[PDB]
Design a binder for this molecule. Structure first.
Ligand SMILES: NCc1cccc(C[C@H](CP(=O)(O)[C@@H](N)CCc2ccccc2)C(=O)O)c1
Ligand SMILES: NCc1cccc(C[C@H](CP(=O)(O)[C@@H](N)CCc2ccccc2)C(=O)O)c1
Ligand SMILES: [Zn+2]
Length: 865
């Protein structure tokens, strides 16, 4: 089996200077012709082209080449010593392409997806990101069937042919890697707008959607204009073409793609209106539209040397999107949401069998590395430069990065060196953030003696499958101090008297001396989640109530609440285990009452403070896990909270209905009241399931936007009443024509805690609006089921067998989706023996499939072997 290793990187033997492409689209076949201008770098080496499309011909300077094709590689030994041309002709059947990588059909239109290695599914090429070329693309198609013909860059020519056909030619003058190629052909509607760059140049903006979907694109257009302006104001970065196209597609393996000047978006990240999309959905559009635009500099103008460097573009662009969203509105709440995501989804990755560094040292299938570690831990790593350097220093690094590397394909090391060099500091130890996997664990203890608060901190990083030796890392720990009434206490550190400091841990163990401390203190630690680590410090439950009630930092208050909930769940696990009554949780209930009643808290922040960690967070670090015991303990906690405060959940609901004030459109202010209301709805229906019939009676009146419809449906989704099934059927009927709302229906089907979810899911497979071949549908139904703790982890193994069967089926046509799904089994080694045995059986059955993809094989191997 082939493994690719970062240590084996070598510059290409050949460059491609110019890439001329011609697409002749017919029914059913598209013929692609290329003309490649090739420049030897290591003269005399064989020319090796990657490719998997049907090959019709290959020429070297106009003459039939003497070549061999074996597997997905075409090799020509007989090549000239000077510049030469290669012409390839391939044939593609796009409607047969259910992988959604390469050239494929969707909705009767044609789209491409090339990142990372899809271009080689279109033609034979040197399909690696360090080969940058200047592309010109000609497209010829039936004008009635495909009136819209797009590719990267500037449209330089076009015309009509007398048999009903037409053509266009696009020139993209910026040399680029093949992964950023795109082509679209279709009958699509356009929404036009524009932005004027700070140098005074207009940029024509065009969003292409189905005709029916066009009324839902306006928020995405506004978001793009906001993102363009922000990259100018915050980073000094301007767009570089007079045209920026975005195309929505409903069959897409990921959220969006930054193809130069012609971004391609999953509909879920471009279409919204308040009737059909939730506030969270609007927030997502804003994030993703921003993300793809930000890639124009961080990814496109400066690209990746090789795919091991993916985080160079993705960590940095995620950081950029996070900062954009934060600057738009609600920064602290949005930062907590990001940290919560990281801990819920990336920490388990780093603790599991598929753990990898931010910059992996090897891979078998690169599509298995578009992960939370590369993206979200990647962004934390970027954010640490900002914490260490400040905004001004961070911008000095950015400035040198582009000065050095505009137009090049570079590495994570180059980014680090620009930050270091622009600021005149040594960041050599920081490199370990790219090369060492695993979540660092800090053990800290503190002591006020004399007038010094002495904080001792030790760090360790566990072995991961790829590496045992982990050396000490460069870890910024942001700190303050609270007195007995929870106000800030100043202290002295490196000459400055302040109420906050960043303590830079670089050794395995260090002591920090915060001097001049005149009162009894409790430290506030890792403020703003200043490094992506586990911190253990001995806090009493009273210390936690103090932090929650009084700390000035959002993260540390939220962390105090999270810790109180974790301790409460642990207490419930102990009683349920001893067969005794549940704990009183008197102190937790006191703290929650204070939160509910505090009217100075931001409402979205209140909502977060009332969220209990997920089962996966709760069983982090455990062995021999019975997931249903954790689910039982967590549900008992939520039930206690629901019942104990029932009258107050209704009261907060009413206050939020009043403060929303009939403002049903999306805005950040209205959205935070709604977020709060939806937390209250959930608790009300937990305590009083019969309230579902009152809900039903007044549904139409409550259903004023999709945030409310989703909030209600989410709250009743686990209810055993027949009404729950009736409300869901009514939802499916009401929104049957909106594929993105049908995704929500299937997600409710798959996520329900009712006892009958598995057979409802099986029925849903055959719903007329379900398609297994559509990634959004498959993720919503099957994906949700795979994350549905009581059902996926059912003792009988029915959940495991069902998910295994669907990995097997999906893998036949879309290995990417299948390899993401099969990660539901990642907990295997840590499960109690009965479930573990069943998980291993499911994974052996997957392995035993003939023709199993490399994608799924790589993952299964990591879990099993
Ligand atoms: N490393 C710099 C570089 C190298 C190679 C190609 C480019 C493309 C760019 C594109 P273009 O010829 O389409 C130019 N006329 C666009 C001007 C413009 C218009 C509107 C908004 C921003 C910029 C140009 O030469 O400015 C840049
Ligand atoms: N942090 C804001 C945010 C939230 C959710 C989704 C995204 C876009 C990113 C897509 P991307 O720009 O990184 C793209 N380079 C991924 C490449 C890819 C690979 C395979 C198939 C389709 C697309 C993704 O799908 O995770 C962004
Ligand atoms: Zn990206």
């Amino acid at each position: 089996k082939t493994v690719h290793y970062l240590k084996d990187y070598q510059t290409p033997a050949y460059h491609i200077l110019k890439t001329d492409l011609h697409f002749d689209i017919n029914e059913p076949q598209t013929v692609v012709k290329s003309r490649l201008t090739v420049e030897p770098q290591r003269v005399g080496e064989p020319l090796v082209l990657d490719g998997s499309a049907k090959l019709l011909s290959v020429k070297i300077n106009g003459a039939a080449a003497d070549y061999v094709l074996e597997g997905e590689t075409l090799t020509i030994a007989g090549v000239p010593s000077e510049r030469f041309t290669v012409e390839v002709e391939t044939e593609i059947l796009p409607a047969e392409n259910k992988s959604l990588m390469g050239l494929y059909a969707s909705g009767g239109n044609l789209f491409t997806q090339c990142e990372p290695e899809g271009f080689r599914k279109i033609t034979f090429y040197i399909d690696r990101p360090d080969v940058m070329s200047k592309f010109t693309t000609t497209i010829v198609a039936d004008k009635k069937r495909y009136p819209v013909l797009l590719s990267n860059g500037n449209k330089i020519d076009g015309g009509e042919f007398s048999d009903g056909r037409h053509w266009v030619k696009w020139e993209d003058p910026f040399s680029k890697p093949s992964y950023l190629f795109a082509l679209v052909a279709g009958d699509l509607a356009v929404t036009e707008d524009y932005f004027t760059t700070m140098s005074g140049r207009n940029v024509k903006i065009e969003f292409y959607t189905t005709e029916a979907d066009k009324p839902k694109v306006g928020f995405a257009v506004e978001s793009l204009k906001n993102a363009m302006k922000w990259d100018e104001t915050r980073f000094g970065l301007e767009y570089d073409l007079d045209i920026f196209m975005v195309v929505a597609v409903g069959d897409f393996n990921m959220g969006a793609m930054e193809n130069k000047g012609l971004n391609i978006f999953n509909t879920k990240f471009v279409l919204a209106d308040s009737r059909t999309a939730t506030d969270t959905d609007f927030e997502g559009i804003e994030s993703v539209v921003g993300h793809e635009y930000f890639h124009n500099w961080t990814g496109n103008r400066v690209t990746c040397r090789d795919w091991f460097q993916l985080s160079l573009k993705e960590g940095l662009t995620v950081f950029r999107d996070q900062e954009f969203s934060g600057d738009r509105a609600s920064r602290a709440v949005r930062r907590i949401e990001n940290i919560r995501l990281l801990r819920q989804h990336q920490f388990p990755e780093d603790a599991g069998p598929t753990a990898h560094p931010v910059r992996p040292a090897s891979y078998e299938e690169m599509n298995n590395f578009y992960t939370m570690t590369v993206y979200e831990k990647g962004a934390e790593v970027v954010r640490m430069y900002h914490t260490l350097l400040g905004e001004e220093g961070f911008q000095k690094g950015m400035k040198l990065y582009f000065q050095r590397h505009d137009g090049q394909a570079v590495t994570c090391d180059d980014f680090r060196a620009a930050m270091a060099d622009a600021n005149g500091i040594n960041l050599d130890q920081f490199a370990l953030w790219y090369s060492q996997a695993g979540t660092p664990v800090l053990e800290a203890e503190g002591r006020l003696k004399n007038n010094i608060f002495e904080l001792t901190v030790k760090q360790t990083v566990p072995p991961t499958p790829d590496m045992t030796d982990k050396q000490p890392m460069m870890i910024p720990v942001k700190v303050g101090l609270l007195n007995r009434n929870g106000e800030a206490v100043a202290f002295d550190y490196q000459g400055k008297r302040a109420t906050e400091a960043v303590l830079l841990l670089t050794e395995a163990e260090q002591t920090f001396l915060l001097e001049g401390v005149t009162e009894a203190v409790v430290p506030s630690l890792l403020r703003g989640f200043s490094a992506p680590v586990h911190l253990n410090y001995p806090y009493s439950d009273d210390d936690l109530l103090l932090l929650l009630a009084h700390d000035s930092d959002a993260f540390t208050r939220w962390e105090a609440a999270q810790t109180l909930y974790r301790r409460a769940v642990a207490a419930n696990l102990a009683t349920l285990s001893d067969g005794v009554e549940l704990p009183k949780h008197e102190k937790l209930l006191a703290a929650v009452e204070k939160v509910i009643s505090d009217d100075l808290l931001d409402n979205a922040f209140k909502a977060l403070l009332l969220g209990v960690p997920s089962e996966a967070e709760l069983w982090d670090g455990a062995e021999n896990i019975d997931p249903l015991r954790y689910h039982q303990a967590r549900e008992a906690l939520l039930d206690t909270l629901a019942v104990h405060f029932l009258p107050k959940w209704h009261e907060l609901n009413r206050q939020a209905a009043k403060q929303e004030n009939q403002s049903y459109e999306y805005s950040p202010e209205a959205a935070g009241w709604r977020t709060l209301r939806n937390v209250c709805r959930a608790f009300v229906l937990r305590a009083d399931p019969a309230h579902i019939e009152t809900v039903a009676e007044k549904y139409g009146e409550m259903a004023q936007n999709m945030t409310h419809e989703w909030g209600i449906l989410s709250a009743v989704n686990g209810n055993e009443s027949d009404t729950r099934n009736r409300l869901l059927a009514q939802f499916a009927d009401k929104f049957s024509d909106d594929a993105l709302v049908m995704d929500k229906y299937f997600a409710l089907v798959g996520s329900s805690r009712r006892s009958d979810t598995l057979q409802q899911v099986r029925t849903a497979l055959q719903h007329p609006k379900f398609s297994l071949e559509n990634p959004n549908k498959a993720r919503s139904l099957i994906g949700s089921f795979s994350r549905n703790v009581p059902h996926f982890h059912a003792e009988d193994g029915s959940g495991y067998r069902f998910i295994a069967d669907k990995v097997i089926e999906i893998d036949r046509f879309n290995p990417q989706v299948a390899a993401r799904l099969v990660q539901a089994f990642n907990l295997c080694n840590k499960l109690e023996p009965h479930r573990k045995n069943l998980v291993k059986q499911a994974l052996q059955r997957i392995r035993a499939q003939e023709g199993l993809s490399k994608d799924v094989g790589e993952i299964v191997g990591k879990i099993l072997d």
